[PDB]
Amino acid sequence: MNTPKEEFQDWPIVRIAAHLPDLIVYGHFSPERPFMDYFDGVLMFVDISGFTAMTEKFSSAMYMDRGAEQLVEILNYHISAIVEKVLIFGGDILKFAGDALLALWRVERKQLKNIITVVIKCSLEIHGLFETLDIRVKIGLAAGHISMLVFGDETHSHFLVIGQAVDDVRLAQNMAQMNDVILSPNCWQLCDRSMIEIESVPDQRAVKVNFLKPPPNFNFDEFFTKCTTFMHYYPSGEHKNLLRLACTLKPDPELEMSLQKYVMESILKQIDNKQLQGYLSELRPVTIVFVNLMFEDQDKAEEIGPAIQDAYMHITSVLKIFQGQINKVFMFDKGCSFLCVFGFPGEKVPDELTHALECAMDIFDFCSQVHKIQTVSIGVASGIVFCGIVGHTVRHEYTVIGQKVNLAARMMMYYPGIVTCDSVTYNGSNLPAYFFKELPKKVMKGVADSGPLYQYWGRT
Ligand SMILES: Nc1ncnc2c1ncn2[C@@H]1O[C@H](COP(=O)(O)CP(=O)(O)OP(=O)(O)O)[C@@H](O)[C@H]1O
Ligand SMILES: Nc1nc(Cl)cc(N(Cc2cccs2)C2CC2)n1
Ligand SMILES: [Ca+2]
Ligand SMILES: [Cl-]
């Protein structure tokens, strides 16, 4: 009696799970919103520098109308290797944003020291990989208490990690010069100092890792194996050949119903083999509306959660009306940011610019009265941006990369408390000139040639 091979592996639920971390896939939590949970772990924020420039070049005529296809190929060639390293070291990729990704090793408080060692080794191996396009990799690490927030409505869900360690990992990474790994202060405080050769960062309690220098008896693989005891989802045994346990998920309509809420409809359409895979990789004219919600420095996560929930409910209704989408949500330095996009798969209109501006003002007016939100700032920029699925086969997300994305994000930070827009949006809108005010030109870090910027004043 024959015993033929292959556990079938490519169910819709498995494909959906590629778009989510284990934190969500295996989360089994309440469907109330907001939902908050608390844990400890180590974070790694890996930020590639140089794909936004590569993006601009790939629109040129030399790429012969295949710039999006070539961009996404070369990006994924590099990012998929990084993702594999993270997964093999036992980490959970939480979210992608353009050419960056945030990863988490959730562990019990007693294991933080040991896990920091595993994550530093992983970081050094990620720097390893890149002795090969013009691109640097900056890595920040942090460790400590982390809170998870899940917010949404009955058909959509969104998550974030929050707290000092999240702020710290971002601050750490941002200090790295090309190809450095930086530890947060608390990470350096908790780590195994005998193993880890560091140096001062000027005007900073963070430190740069110079070397991993283990003792005589230390064998990394035996050490790593012991650390796997504390990793709940590390593929093992008959599944040690897999990069994720999520590859073994079996059909379960209730779990699927829950996971699909995190993923865009156009992505679900591709997952369901109702649209061609290549259709979502594009260099497409869009309008980016980047909305920043600032909370007071005193604010704790249990106050932040209901306020993001409230803002979200309004953002989503306004976007539905004006034909916009939330591409990604971020939070650090007391600012929760919604990266919103007008134009992309299906939603292409003619009055898109007018609509992005009115939508932005509606969001600004509503969110300004949400209890606990100190300041709303919204940057609006229009241009050619790369849209597509970034990452590895087993762990990837839809995202956007482009100069106008970065510009919108810089506007919102440099021109706080107002709605700002770029020249393309200004000249291209229906609207008369006195709806606007021309702004003083600020020198913006990582932005040159930016052109005239405007405040969207409104009808009044
Ligand atoms: N998705 C993201 N989430 C959080 N912070 C980000 C981010 N992208 C960039 N940043 C932060 O802002 C800092 C400056 O980023 P920038 O210099 O403006 C673009 P980059 O990340 O260097 O290269 P790039 O745009 O080719 O990819 C970063 O070092 C990082 O701390
Ligand atoms: N707060 C938060 N949560 C998640 Cl899950 C991701 C995220 N971001 C922004 C941050 C990067 C570094 C610390 S927070 C990642 C996807 C870019 N921010
Ligand atoms: Ca980047
Ligand atoms: Cl891949």
Coordinates of C-alpha atoms and ligand atoms in Angstrom, one line a residue:
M1 CA 0.0 0.0 0.0
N2 CA 1.6 3.2 -1.2
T3 CA 2.6 6.2 1.0
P4 CA 2.8 9.2 -1.5
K5 CA 4.6 12.4 -0.5
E6 CA 3.6 16.1 0.1
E7 CA 1.4 17.5 2.8
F8 CA -0.5 20.1 0.6
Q9 CA 0.6 23.4 1.7
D10 CA -0.8 26.3 -0.4
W11 CA -4.3 26.9 1.1
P12 CA -5.8 30.4 1.1
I13 CA -5.3 30.6 4.9
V14 CA -1.6 29.9 4.5
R15 CA -1.3 32.6 1.8
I16 CA -3.1 35.1 4.0
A17 CA -0.7 34.2 6.9
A18 CA 2.3 35.2 4.8
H19 CA 1.1 38.8 5.3
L20 CA 1.0 38.6 9.1
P21 CA 3.3 37.9 12.0
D22 CA 3.0 35.0 14.4
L23 CA 2.0 37.6 17.1
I24 CA -1.3 37.9 15.1
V25 CA -1.6 34.4 13.4
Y26 CA -1.3 32.5 16.7
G27 CA -2.8 35.3 18.8
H28 CA -6.2 33.9 19.6
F29 CA -7.4 37.2 21.3
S30 CA -10.7 38.9 21.9
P31 CA -12.4 40.6 19.0
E32 CA -13.3 43.7 21.0
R33 CA -11.6 47.0 19.9
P34 CA -9.3 48.4 21.1
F35 CA -7.6 45.3 22.4
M36 CA -4.4 45.6 24.4
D37 CA -1.9 43.0 25.6
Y38 CA 1.5 43.3 27.4
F39 CA 4.7 41.2 27.2
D40 CA 8.5 41.5 27.0
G41 CA 10.9 41.0 24.3
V42 CA 13.7 42.1 22.0
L43 CA 13.2 44.2 18.9
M44 CA 15.2 44.7 15.8
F45 CA 14.6 47.5 13.3
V46 CA 16.3 46.9 10.0
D47 CA 16.3 50.0 7.7
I48 CA 17.8 49.8 4.3
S49 CA 19.0 53.2 3.0
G50 CA 19.0 53.7 -0.8
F51 CA 15.9 52.1 -2.3
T52 CA 14.0 55.5 -2.4
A53 CA 16.7 56.8 -4.8
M54 CA 16.7 53.6 -6.8
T55 CA 13.0 54.0 -7.1
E56 CA 13.4 57.5 -8.8
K57 CA 15.9 56.2 -11.3
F58 CA 13.7 53.1 -12.3
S59 CA 11.1 55.4 -13.8
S60 CA 13.7 56.5 -16.5
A61 CA 13.5 55.5 -20.0
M62 CA 16.4 53.1 -19.7
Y63 CA 14.2 50.6 -17.8
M64 CA 11.9 50.4 -20.8
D65 CA 8.6 50.5 -18.9
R66 CA 9.7 47.6 -16.6
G67 CA 11.1 49.7 -13.7
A68 CA 8.5 48.4 -11.2
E69 CA 9.2 44.8 -12.1
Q70 CA 13.0 45.3 -11.9
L71 CA 12.7 47.4 -8.6
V72 CA 10.7 44.8 -6.8
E73 CA 12.9 42.0 -8.1
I74 CA 16.1 43.6 -6.8
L75 CA 14.5 44.7 -3.6
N76 CA 13.1 41.3 -2.8
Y77 CA 16.3 39.6 -3.7
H78 CA 18.0 41.5 -0.8
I79 CA 15.0 41.8 1.7
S80 CA 14.1 38.1 1.3
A81 CA 17.6 37.2 2.5
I82 CA 17.3 39.4 5.5
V83 CA 13.9 37.9 6.3
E84 CA 15.2 34.4 6.1
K85 CA 18.0 35.3 8.6
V86 CA 15.5 36.7 11.0
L87 CA 13.2 33.7 10.7
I88 CA 16.1 31.2 11.2
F89 CA 17.2 33.1 14.3
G90 CA 13.7 32.6 15.7
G91 CA 12.4 36.1 15.2
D92 CA 8.8 37.2 14.2
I93 CA 8.7 39.9 11.4
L94 CA 6.0 42.3 12.7
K95 CA 5.6 44.7 9.8
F96 CA 7.3 45.9 6.6
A97 CA 7.4 49.6 5.6
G98 CA 9.0 50.3 2.2
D99 CA 12.6 49.1 2.6
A100 CA 12.5 48.6 6.4
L101 CA 11.1 45.9 8.7
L102 CA 10.6 45.6 12.4
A103 CA 11.2 42.1 14.1
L104 CA 10.3 40.8 17.6
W105 CA 11.6 38.0 19.8
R106 CA 8.9 37.7 22.4
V107 CA 10.2 36.0 25.6
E108 CA 9.8 35.8 29.3
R109 CA 11.6 38.4 31.2
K110 CA 14.4 35.9 32.5
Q111 CA 15.4 35.0 29.0
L112 CA 15.9 38.6 27.7
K113 CA 19.7 38.5 28.3
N114 CA 20.2 35.3 26.4
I115 CA 17.9 36.3 23.5
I116 CA 19.7 39.6 23.1
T117 CA 22.8 37.5 22.3
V118 CA 20.9 35.6 19.6
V119 CA 19.6 38.8 18.1
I120 CA 23.0 40.5 18.0
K121 CA 24.4 37.5 16.2
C122 CA 21.6 37.6 13.7
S123 CA 22.2 41.4 13.2
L124 CA 25.9 40.8 12.6
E125 CA 25.0 38.1 10.0
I126 CA 22.6 40.5 8.3
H127 CA 25.5 43.0 7.9
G128 CA 27.5 40.0 6.7
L129 CA 25.3 39.3 3.8
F130 CA 25.9 42.7 2.1
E131 CA 29.3 42.9 0.5
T132 CA 27.6 43.1 -3.0
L133 CA 23.3 48.6 -6.3
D134 CA 24.2 51.5 -3.9
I135 CA 22.6 50.5 -0.4
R136 CA 23.4 50.6 3.3
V137 CA 21.6 48.6 6.2
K138 CA 21.2 50.3 9.6
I139 CA 20.1 48.1 12.6
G140 CA 18.8 49.1 15.9
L141 CA 18.1 46.8 18.9
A142 CA 16.0 47.4 22.0
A143 CA 14.6 45.2 24.8
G144 CA 12.0 45.6 27.5
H145 CA 8.3 45.8 28.2
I146 CA 6.2 46.0 25.0
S147 CA 2.4 46.5 24.6
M148 CA 0.3 45.3 21.6
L149 CA -2.6 47.4 20.4
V150 CA -5.2 46.0 18.0
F151 CA -7.8 48.4 16.6
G152 CA -10.4 48.2 13.8
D153 CA -14.0 47.7 12.9
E154 CA -16.0 44.6 12.1
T155 CA -14.3 44.1 8.7
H156 CA -10.7 45.5 9.2
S157 CA -8.0 45.1 11.8
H158 CA -4.7 46.9 12.5
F159 CA -2.0 46.3 15.1
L160 CA 1.0 48.2 16.6
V161 CA 3.5 47.6 19.2
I162 CA 4.0 50.4 21.7
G163 CA 6.2 51.6 24.5
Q164 CA 9.6 52.8 25.5
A165 CA 11.4 49.8 23.9
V166 CA 9.6 50.5 20.6
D167 CA 10.7 54.2 20.7
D168 CA 14.1 53.1 21.7
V169 CA 14.6 50.7 18.8
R170 CA 13.8 53.4 16.3
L171 CA 16.1 56.0 18.0
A172 CA 18.9 53.3 18.0
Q173 CA 18.6 52.5 14.4
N174 CA 18.5 56.2 13.4
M175 CA 22.0 56.7 15.1
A176 CA 23.7 54.0 13.0
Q177 CA 26.2 55.1 10.4
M178 CA 26.3 52.9 7.4
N179 CA 26.2 49.3 8.4
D180 CA 26.3 49.6 12.2
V181 CA 24.2 47.8 14.9
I182 CA 23.2 50.0 17.7
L183 CA 21.9 48.9 21.1
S184 CA 19.3 50.9 23.1
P185 CA 20.4 51.9 26.7
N186 CA 18.1 49.4 28.2
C187 CA 19.3 46.7 25.8
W188 CA 22.9 47.4 26.8
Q189 CA 21.8 47.3 30.5
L190 CA 20.2 43.9 30.1
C191 CA 22.7 42.2 27.7
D192 CA 25.5 39.7 28.5
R193 CA 28.3 42.3 28.7
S194 CA 31.1 39.6 28.7
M195 CA 30.2 38.5 25.2
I196 CA 29.7 41.9 23.6
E197 CA 32.4 44.5 22.7
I198 CA 30.8 48.0 22.3
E199 CA 31.7 51.7 22.0
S200 CA 30.2 55.0 23.1
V201 CA 27.9 56.9 20.8
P202 CA 28.6 60.7 21.2
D203 CA 25.9 62.5 23.3
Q204 CA 24.1 59.2 23.6
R205 CA 23.7 56.5 26.2
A206 CA 23.2 54.0 23.2
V207 CA 26.2 52.0 22.1
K208 CA 27.5 50.5 19.0
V209 CA 28.4 46.8 18.8
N210 CA 31.9 46.2 17.7
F211 CA 32.3 42.4 18.2
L212 CA 30.7 39.3 19.6
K213 CA 33.6 37.7 21.5
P214 CA 32.3 34.6 23.3
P215 CA 34.1 32.7 26.0
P216 CA 36.2 29.5 25.4
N217 CA 33.4 27.0 26.1
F218 CA 30.8 28.9 24.1
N219 CA 29.3 27.1 21.1
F220 CA 26.7 29.3 19.3
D221 CA 24.6 26.4 18.0
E222 CA 24.3 24.7 21.4
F223 CA 23.5 28.0 22.9
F224 CA 20.8 28.7 20.2
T225 CA 19.3 25.3 20.7
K226 CA 18.8 26.1 24.4
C227 CA 17.3 29.4 23.5
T228 CA 14.8 27.5 21.3
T229 CA 13.1 26.1 24.5
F230 CA 11.7 29.5 25.1
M231 CA 10.5 30.0 21.4
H232 CA 7.0 28.8 21.1
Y233 CA 6.7 28.6 17.3
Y234 CA 10.2 27.7 16.2
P235 CA 9.8 25.1 13.5
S236 CA 11.1 21.8 14.8
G237 CA 11.0 18.0 14.4
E238 CA 9.1 17.0 11.3
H239 CA 8.8 20.7 10.5
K240 CA 12.4 21.8 11.0
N241 CA 12.8 22.2 7.2
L242 CA 10.2 25.1 7.2
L243 CA 10.9 28.7 7.7
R244 CA 7.6 29.3 9.5
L245 CA 5.2 27.1 11.4
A246 CA 2.5 29.2 9.7
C247 CA 3.2 27.3 6.5
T248 CA 1.4 24.3 8.2
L249 CA -1.8 26.1 8.9
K250 CA -4.9 24.2 7.9
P251 CA -8.2 25.5 6.8
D252 CA -10.3 27.0 9.6
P253 CA -13.0 29.5 8.5
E254 CA -13.2 31.3 11.8
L255 CA -9.3 31.8 11.9
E256 CA -9.4 32.8 8.3
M257 CA -12.2 35.3 8.9
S258 CA -10.1 36.9 11.6
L259 CA -6.8 37.0 9.6
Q260 CA -8.3 38.4 6.4
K261 CA -9.3 41.6 8.2
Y262 CA -5.7 42.6 8.2
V263 CA -5.1 42.3 4.5
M264 CA -6.2 44.6 1.6
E265 CA -9.0 43.4 -0.7
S266 CA -6.8 43.6 -3.8
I267 CA -4.3 41.3 -2.1
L268 CA -7.1 38.8 -1.1
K269 CA -8.1 38.9 -4.8
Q270 CA -4.6 37.8 -5.8
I271 CA -4.5 35.2 -3.1
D272 CA -7.8 33.8 -4.4
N273 CA -6.4 33.6 -7.9
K274 CA -8.8 36.1 -9.2
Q275 CA -6.2 38.6 -10.4
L276 CA -2.7 38.1 -12.0
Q277 CA 0.2 38.2 -9.5
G278 CA 2.1 40.9 -11.5
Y279 CA -0.8 43.3 -11.3
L280 CA 0.2 44.9 -7.9
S281 CA 3.9 45.6 -8.7
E282 CA 3.6 49.1 -10.3
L283 CA 5.2 52.6 -10.5
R284 CA 1.9 54.4 -10.2
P285 CA 0.9 58.1 -9.9
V286 CA -0.7 58.5 -6.4
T287 CA -1.4 60.9 -3.7
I288 CA 0.0 60.2 -0.3
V289 CA -1.9 61.6 2.7
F290 CA 0.3 61.0 5.8
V291 CA -1.6 61.7 9.0
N292 CA 0.3 62.0 12.4
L293 CA -1.5 61.8 15.8
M294 CA 0.6 63.2 18.6
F295 CA -0.1 62.2 22.3
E296 CA 1.3 63.9 25.5
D297 CA 4.6 62.6 26.8
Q298 CA 2.7 61.5 30.0
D299 CA 0.3 59.2 28.0
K300 CA 0.2 55.5 28.8
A301 CA -0.8 52.9 26.3
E302 CA -4.3 52.3 28.0
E303 CA -5.1 56.0 27.1
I304 CA -3.6 55.9 23.6
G305 CA -5.5 52.8 22.5
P306 CA -9.2 54.2 22.7
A307 CA -8.0 57.5 21.0
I308 CA -6.4 55.6 18.1
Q309 CA -9.6 53.5 17.9
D310 CA -11.7 56.6 17.7
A311 CA -9.5 58.4 15.2
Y312 CA -9.4 55.2 13.1
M313 CA -13.2 54.9 12.9
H314 CA -13.4 58.4 11.5
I315 CA -10.4 57.9 9.1
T316 CA -11.8 54.8 7.6
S317 CA -15.3 56.4 6.9
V318 CA -13.8 59.5 5.4
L319 CA -11.4 57.4 3.2
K320 CA -14.3 55.2 2.0
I321 CA -16.1 58.4 0.9
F322 CA -13.1 59.9 -0.8
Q323 CA -11.8 56.6 -2.3
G324 CA -8.6 56.3 -0.2
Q325 CA -6.8 53.4 1.6
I326 CA -4.7 53.0 4.7
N327 CA -1.5 51.4 3.4
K328 CA 0.3 51.2 6.8
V329 CA 0.1 52.4 10.4
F330 CA 3.2 53.2 12.5
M331 CA 3.9 54.5 16.1
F332 CA 7.0 55.9 17.8
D333 CA 8.1 59.1 19.7
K334 CA 4.4 59.6 20.9
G335 CA 3.2 59.9 17.2
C336 CA 0.8 57.4 15.6
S337 CA 1.0 57.8 11.8
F338 CA -1.5 56.5 9.1
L339 CA 0.1 56.2 5.6
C340 CA -2.9 56.8 3.4
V341 CA -3.0 56.5 -0.4
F342 CA -5.3 57.8 -3.1
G343 CA -5.2 56.4 -6.6
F344 CA -4.0 52.7 -6.2
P345 CA -5.5 49.3 -7.5
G346 CA -9.2 50.1 -8.5
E347 CA -9.5 53.6 -6.9
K348 CA -8.1 55.7 -9.9
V349 CA -10.3 58.8 -10.4
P350 CA -9.9 62.3 -12.0
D351 CA -10.5 64.7 -9.0
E352 CA -8.2 62.7 -6.8
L353 CA -6.2 65.8 -5.6
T354 CA -9.1 67.8 -4.5
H355 CA -10.4 64.7 -2.8
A356 CA -7.1 64.0 -1.0
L357 CA -7.1 67.6 0.3
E358 CA -10.8 67.6 1.5
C359 CA -10.3 64.2 3.0
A360 CA -7.2 65.5 4.8
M361 CA -9.1 68.5 6.2
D362 CA -12.0 66.3 7.3
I363 CA -9.5 64.0 9.1
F364 CA -7.7 66.9 10.6
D365 CA -11.0 68.5 12.0
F366 CA -12.3 65.3 13.4
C367 CA -9.1 64.0 14.9
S368 CA -8.3 67.4 16.5
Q369 CA -11.2 66.8 18.9
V370 CA -10.5 63.3 19.9
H371 CA -9.8 63.1 23.6
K372 CA -6.1 62.7 24.2
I373 CA -4.8 63.6 20.8
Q374 CA -2.6 66.7 21.4
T375 CA -1.8 67.6 17.8
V376 CA -2.8 66.4 14.3
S377 CA -0.4 67.0 11.4
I378 CA -1.1 65.9 7.8
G379 CA 1.3 65.9 4.9
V380 CA 0.0 65.5 1.3
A381 CA 2.2 64.8 -1.7
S382 CA 1.6 63.5 -5.2
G383 CA 3.8 61.7 -7.5
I384 CA 5.1 58.4 -8.9
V385 CA 5.6 55.8 -6.2
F386 CA 6.4 52.2 -6.2
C387 CA 3.6 49.9 -5.0
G388 CA 4.0 46.2 -4.4
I389 CA 4.5 43.1 -2.3
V390 CA 7.9 43.3 -0.4
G391 CA 9.6 40.5 1.5
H392 CA 10.0 36.7 1.2
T393 CA 7.5 34.2 -0.1
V394 CA 6.7 33.0 3.4
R395 CA 6.5 36.6 5.0
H396 CA 5.8 39.7 2.9
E397 CA 3.5 42.7 2.8
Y398 CA 2.1 45.2 0.4
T399 CA 3.9 48.5 0.8
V400 CA 5.0 51.7 -1.0
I401 CA 8.3 53.4 -1.6
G402 CA 9.0 56.7 -3.1
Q403 CA 10.4 60.2 -2.8
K404 CA 6.8 61.6 -2.3
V405 CA 6.2 59.2 0.5
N406 CA 9.2 60.4 2.3
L407 CA 8.2 64.0 1.5
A408 CA 4.7 63.6 2.9
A409 CA 6.3 62.1 6.1
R410 CA 8.8 65.0 6.5
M411 CA 6.0 67.6 5.9
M412 CA 3.9 66.2 8.7
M413 CA 6.8 66.3 11.1
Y414 CA 8.3 69.7 10.1
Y415 CA 4.9 71.5 9.8
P416 CA 3.1 70.3 12.8
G417 CA -0.5 71.1 13.6
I418 CA -1.6 71.9 10.0
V419 CA -2.4 70.2 6.7
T420 CA 0.4 70.7 4.2
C421 CA 0.7 69.9 0.5
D422 CA 3.3 69.8 -2.2
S423 CA 3.2 71.8 -5.6
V424 CA 1.9 69.0 -7.7
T425 CA -1.1 68.7 -5.4
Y426 CA -1.6 72.5 -5.2
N427 CA -1.4 73.2 -9.0
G428 CA -3.3 70.1 -9.8
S429 CA -6.2 70.5 -7.4
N430 CA -9.5 72.1 -8.7
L431 CA -9.3 74.6 -5.9
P432 CA -8.6 78.4 -5.9
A433 CA -5.4 79.8 -4.6
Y434 CA -6.7 81.4 -1.5
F435 CA -7.7 78.0 -0.1
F436 CA -3.9 77.7 0.4
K437 CA -1.0 79.5 2.0
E438 CA 2.5 79.4 0.6
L439 CA 4.9 78.3 3.4
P440 CA 8.5 79.2 4.4
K441 CA 10.9 76.6 2.8
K442 CA 12.4 74.5 5.7
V443 CA 15.6 72.5 5.1
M444 CA 14.3 69.0 5.7
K445 CA 16.6 66.1 6.7
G446 CA 16.9 63.6 3.8
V447 CA 15.1 65.9 1.3
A448 CA 16.4 68.3 -1.3
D449 CA 14.9 69.9 -4.4
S450 CA 11.5 69.7 -2.6
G451 CA 9.8 72.7 -4.4
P452 CA 7.3 75.1 -2.9
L453 CA 5.1 73.8 0.0
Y454 CA 1.6 75.0 1.0
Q455 CA -0.6 74.9 3.9
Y456 CA -4.1 73.8 2.9
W457 CA -6.0 76.6 4.7
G458 CA -9.5 75.5 3.7
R459 CA -12.5 77.4 2.3
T460 CA -12.5 79.8 5.2
Ligands
LIG1 N1 9.2 53.0 8.1 C1 9.9 53.8 9.0 N2 9.5 53.7 10.3 C2 10.1 54.4 11.3 N3 11.1 55.2 11.0 C3 11.6 55.4 9.7 C4 11.0 54.6 8.6 N4 11.7 55.0 7.5 C5 12.6 55.9 7.9 N5 12.5 56.1 9.2 C6 13.3 57.0 10.2 O1 13.7 58.3 9.8 C7 15.1 58.3 9.7 C8 15.6 58.8 8.4 O2 15.1 58.0 7.3 P1 15.4 58.7 5.9 O3 16.9 59.2 5.9 O4 14.5 60.0 5.8 C9 15.1 57.5 4.6 P2 16.2 56.1 4.7 O5 15.4 55.2 5.8 O6 17.5 56.4 5.1 O7 16.5 55.6 3.2 P3 15.5 55.4 2.0 O8 14.4 56.3 2.0 O9 16.2 54.9 0.7 O10 15.0 54.0 2.2 C10 15.5 56.8 9.6 O11 16.9 56.7 9.9 C11 14.5 56.2 10.6 O12 14.9 56.3 12.0
LIG2 N1 4.5 51.0 16.5 C1 4.8 50.2 15.4 N2 4.4 48.9 15.4 C2 4.6 48.2 14.3 CL1 4.0 46.6 14.4 C3 5.4 48.6 13.3 C4 5.9 50.0 13.4 N3 6.8 50.5 12.6 C5 7.4 51.7 12.9 C6 8.6 51.5 13.8 C7 9.9 51.3 13.5 C8 10.7 51.2 14.6 C9 10.0 51.2 15.9 S1 8.4 51.5 15.5 C10 7.5 49.6 11.6 C11 6.8 49.1 10.3 C12 7.8 50.3 10.3 N4 5.5 50.7 14.5
CA3 CA 14.6 53.1 4.5
CL4 CL 11.4 34.8 -1.5

